[model samples]
Target: STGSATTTPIDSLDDAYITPVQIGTPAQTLNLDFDTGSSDLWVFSSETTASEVDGQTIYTPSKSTTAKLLSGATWSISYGDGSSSSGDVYTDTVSVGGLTVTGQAVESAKKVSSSFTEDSTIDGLLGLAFSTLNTVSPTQQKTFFDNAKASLDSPVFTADLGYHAPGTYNFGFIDTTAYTGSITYTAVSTKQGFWEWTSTGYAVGSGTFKSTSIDGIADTGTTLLYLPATVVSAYWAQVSGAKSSSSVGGYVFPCSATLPSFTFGVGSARIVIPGDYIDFGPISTGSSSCFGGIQSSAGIGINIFGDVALKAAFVVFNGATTPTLGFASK
Candidate 1:
């Protein structure tokens, strides 16, 4: 079987993307962040602390006859940004687009961080990373993709993230019309439970390509593109008035600075990120300095090709026997 769902950026900066998901028997529709960085299908629910609940929607399992408590099951997940959530587990009929997964593990949040409470646009997160990264205790559960892969015509999902517009997530098959040019395939190492791969090299706008290997993970959950300090410095150096400010916490440049595009290699293919996409907008309202979308990953421990990079191309998370990733220009 196959399915397709529309996902839209939550804000003008494209900080995150959210998609509608149907949960329980009667299908409580909730907008969830489809995160490829973590593995745990968690949601804000009736079980959550009332004080922790803000403007977000909650899922009430009791309202669905198909809901079954996963006794003794519990889950807790913490993100790199320090936000976290913990919850009990329930098995219910879950659907995304037209695809259905019976008895899918749905974590009902009981406690959530203040950051999550303040983010009213997203009710929860739907993990798309490998199930090996699931945070459930006692027994781990499969991700929606893992559970539904067997019945799918193709064990793959595609991410077409947009800059300011709505994009799409396609399951079971690739939408040929959504991308241009041929896809360039590369091996993926799931050792860290991420869609981890090595980018051949990169080049500053209109510059010669650097022939080096840069290993990183393609993370949809993250907001910015993080690369090696060397790469990041090289890109920023080309822009006049750009500097790494400790007070601002990253590389920031004048809002009027003419930024250069970035290009990264995927095998023989090169994907270019437009310069305008790199200017992530002003650091503060009415500020003249803007933060960059690409930053140094030195402090992050690992490089991450986040929404900033993904939005520039068509990405395929191929879950075949030998897992691989495919990238193409849109």
Candidate 2:
């Protein structure tokens, strides 16, 4: 079996990508963020505190005939950005595009962070990471992808994230037309419960490719790209007036400065990120200082190839017995 779905950027800055998901018997449709960094398929729900609910849609399991409580099961998760949520668990029928998985664990949020409440565009997060990272207590639950993998023609999924337009996520098969050039495959380490891999090297715009082993994770949930301080500094140095500012919380440059493109290696294949993508956006509303999409990962501990980098190419998460990652220019 196979399935496909369209995912759209929540806003012009591409803060997050959301895809429609149907939960429960009658199908409670909610736009969920397909987060590759997390393992809990959680949602805003009637169980959540009224004070925490804003303009977001809430999932009410009581109205779903197929919803069954996972007695005593609970889950709590915290993100790198300090956002957090906790809730009870329920098993329900969940569908994405045309893919359906019965008895899927659906985490109903009882408490949520202020940041989540403010983001009205997303109703929840559908984790695509390994099930080993699941946060449920007593008995852990498999992620939506894990549960659906066996039924799929191939135990794999692909992500084609867009800049400001809609992209697609395909399961079971690779869409040849979605990308150009041959796919470069790399080994993945699931020990960390992430799609972690080692990059061949990197280079600044028009500069020579530096051959170094850089280990990082392909995280669709994150908004920016993070690399070693040395790499980040080198990229920013090319842009006059760009500096790492503590007050701005990261590397920022004059909005008028000419930014250079960034290129990273995947085996022998090189993926170039356009200069406009590196400029990220203004630090503040109508501000002259622009934040950079690429930043130092010193504080993050792990380097992350987030949306900023992933959007430049098509990516595949192979879930075969020996997992691997595939990257192709689009």
Candidate 3:
């Protein structure tokens, strides 16, 4: 690490991308899912097959001034949530406000599923988590942020999620100085797709989880938060009309109850779980929406935490710190 031994300004760059951020040239607008679980950025292409690309946001490169595909590099990534996308790789002169990064790698999926098309609020997913879970055809071990940071006009990227109350979630212009906590780093694991964390303990109200310990790692990549069966049962009891559902892997309950405030403690800081997280239904079905918190552990047996937990704080990974117990979080 001739250049690596010494810390560069690019070394402090953050790679996590939040959900539904506005990213693209004004000529063409792209609303995408900011994935903290993956490393690359992908959008459903207009040239894609309608059947598979139905629910995906199609990126019209013609609208952008700079864009090109990486010949022979293509890939497909499928998550446990039953979501999947695949296509050839491409690059663009990507710009996020004042910070300009050139030839940013992107995935162009020709086919997507209804799930990708249904939520039309955003057009695509912008992955900024880390390199451990990149979906590249040639199999890249480094993320787009990591790859392009060295030469970026400003290599540091930030996340600014402004005030999610009842129905609003915006991502832009990270208040560069809103955060004041001391930064700590955790080592990255090459075993899984996400930069996961091993929770020391998770707290709900004043209750402490002692029935079991975490078996999986913490993932900032996903949006949907997951829990185990016993935890779900305990959680549902406090939540109104929360019941067990065999179809879904976790607890499903009415979203309109007076949800209590809960906090998840990790290391020295604690993150509060917003009360509105339980309200999953609109007036459409006269109140017929149930949420999935913890159900059966079929595919992956460990408890998972996603972006829901990350948006509340600033996280740094210390790969050179330790390596015995899988991973830890800041």
Candidate 4:
């Protein structure tokens, strides 16, 4: 396994909500939130009233022999993403990738706002970020990573992202077939597993960084890949007729445009976004659609690569051993 862990253009908290989480070998049913910004695992229960919660994933504990609630303890969480949910804390069993983790605590919301109530297909978010942000004191919380870490090959877990691929997405297990090259990594700081670097100006379809004076950081917590706005505009300036369309807002261009190639020159290897991902998606400003790139995150504290970037390569988050990310070329 190389180790790690997507979504759409959605401003609503519910748009990127719940997905079915399989528990046990046959993957007994459970719904979960696939989140990256914060690491917390939770779910809903049958005891929860539908009247109270207009839209939430409800699972019947009595239906499962292993399900159990932890007394009257309640848990509540609100995210910087303008989202919040509160529910009772319970421990049962959660399984993914054929791996089962027992005594796992999950949040079962008793009530949710209109936003969550309306989202039918999307129920919860699956958080893929590091465990440091886990709200459950270390002794109380257990994330999907804690269990999947043991099942990794070569002491590493790989993420095969279907983000840039056609069709819906899927996670868990590293697909060796996706890559044939050796992995390389840059050391990370201990306080947070964040990967930092001096600004190495980005380039399109080239090996060189347009400039070397810019500095930045790579984050998986945020769901959008961010770069300096000035640099982004300049890079697109190279593309003929590549104007910002207010409709499809994130940095977009004509689907048939012969786009310029670009690279995020790290140290030795340059991370290049494929043309498909570059030209992927459409954004709107209430009138028309415009071209967009993972969403500009220049002012944000973090320069998150999100699922788009993580899915592009094989990454290993080695916190216990090296405190740095080990990346392999895909």
Candidate 5:
């Protein structure tokens, strides 16, 4: 059967988005972050220590008649922000919208870092990356999309992310009305379990597009658009009073700074990030300073086109053939 779901806007945390999915037999609905950068579908569960679990709703496998424990199996993951989680596994039915997978592997958390426990709102993560990158020990598990693709009308999904507004994830079909103009498709290289692609170049404001190539990943979980250090420096140089702040962190600028449109190439099609989108919000509430939405991807090996960048365009994650990425202005 085909499936689809709408993303709920989370204003409490930097424009984050979460979608609900049902787990177990009778259905235990949980809000999960649909992360394209990760490949493991895991959640805080009954197994988690009471102290480790905060406001997150725990998954109780024992309560589900369909839950079956996978002996000797476990999963542990470390995030880019240094947060970590380790969990045991269970096989059960997982459903998203109208689509249901009968034997989906679900990891139940035994331990989670304070970062995750503190987040409170997100109950788990539904990884949309390639299944080859799954962190389950002994055997790599397939993602929700992977397990559901064969039964789908077409092995494709579209992410329509709006700025601080509700968006949708359409599975098995593409909605023509969701996007404008012709979609420009670009070949993807998924060697790293990511939708990786190389942009022909980038341009600042209305300036000429430079011929510098950049290799990056499309990540829905991340909030900001991360570019290489050299590229970040070039963009900030155009701002009149932008600087890397020691206190505010990352690049910050006066709220009144005149910013320019940042455009990056996708083959011959260029997607432009408006200047207003570049202002990520004030460094501190009621303050006259603001943080930048584009920053250096120094520590993270690959540049990431996160929510800020993705929201500027309508994205198609096509897993039908070579796993191409299609882009069009929203």
Candidate 6:
């Protein structure tokens, strides 16, 4: 067996994909967001304050025979979107796809910030980031991927994100049928607990590709592609009616505008983000203005190649010593 599982996207927001993860014995299933930006496998559970949970399904550890409380243990996490969650920890059997991980540190949500509590659909988060980034106190937790990698046929997973459509996250093996042509790879730095890589350069439209390297991360949780301020400015300048909109925020362009393709470098290869993608969608109803999917990652520091950019290619998240990223046109 390939030791892999398939993931599906949420109905409304194609922003993130959720997979069925089983925790404890008898299999208490939960829909979890597979986030690569952070490492913490937490779920909304009976431990959370009732008022804090609006409509999310909660995990009950007491009912599972395999659950064991980790006395004096706790965990907390905060996202860039302002969403946060904190809770107690329990040791349980956690399974992702067909791969089973025993003694996985399952964080049960006891207190969730408004950012997460208000989001009705998300039941929990299954972080695929490095285990060193885990938030459990006293002793850090290992993510489902981290715990199961040793058992996989190959230490790797691939993410196929779609634009407002269903996509799949495959673990253990890279299915060649999922991508086109060759998969271009680049070395990544795991020191920061992210899939960080430096692109040789980028270009707006068919213009000359700049030579300066741009360092960034491949984040599945983020919705848009964020680049340096100057790089963002140069890309938008090519769009006729594009401008920084104080009202709508970020850069907005005419919905009818013909956008040029945005290209990024990977060694000697290039990944082209279609012109249509640069124009996210119309801003509000009955408006000719649209939001630019590519924005500036100025205040945040490092650039991010989020769903917007990853969706344009087949991305391989290698789970091995000296991690690397392999990209190919979808």
Residues 1-330, model 3: lDDT tens digits: 001101011011112232332233543445555555566677777666776654445676666667665778887877667877777876765443334456677677776666666644545566656666777867573554566455543333343222242111222222224456543333445466555555545556557644334454445445445666555566567876777665554556775566654455454445566545434443235656555433334446656665444544444332222322121122
Candidate 1: tens digits of C-alpha lDDT, residues 76-146: 99998899999999999889989999999999999999999999999999999999999999999999999
Give the TM-score (vs. native) of candidate 3: 0.72
- lDDT: worst 10-residue window of model 2: 275-284
Clashing pairs in 5: none
Tell me the TM-score of each prediction against the true structure: 0.99, 0.99, 0.72, 0.74, 0.95, 0.94
Q: Across residues 1-330, which tens digit of lDDT does each residue of candidate 2 receive?
A: 888999999998888999999999899999999999889999999999999999889899999999999999999999988999999999999999899999999999999999999999999999998999999998999999999999999999999999888999998999999999899999999999999999999999999999999999999999999999999999999999999999989999999988889999999999999988777789989999999999999999899999999999999999999999999999
User: Higher-lDDT candidate among 5 and 6?
Assistant: 5
Residue 69: error of model 2 in Å?
0.4
lDDT of each: 0.95, 0.94, 0.51, 0.53, 0.88, 0.86
Instruction: Encode model 6's per-residue lDDT on 1-330: one tens digit a residue.
Output: 244555666654355667788898888998888888889999999999999999888889999999999999999888877788999999999877777888999999999998677877778998888888999998887888888788788889888877667677887899899988899989999989999999999989999999888999998877789999999999999998899887777999998899999998888888899887676677887888988989989878889998778888899999788789999987
Candidate 5 ranges beyond 4 A from true positions: 12-14
What is the lDDT for 118 in model 3? 63
Which ranges in model 4 have alpha carbons more than 4 Å from their true place? 1-20, 24-27, 31-33, 44-57, 112-119, 137-140, 147-155, 163-176, 190-201, 211-223, 240-258, 284-288
lDDT of 1: 0.95
Error at 284, model 3, angstroms: 7.0
For residue 268, model 6's alpha carbon misses the true position, in angstroms, by 1.2
Give the lowest summed-lDDT range of ten residues in model 3. Answer: 1-10
lDDT of 5 at 35: 88
Prediction 1 TM-score vs. true? 0.99
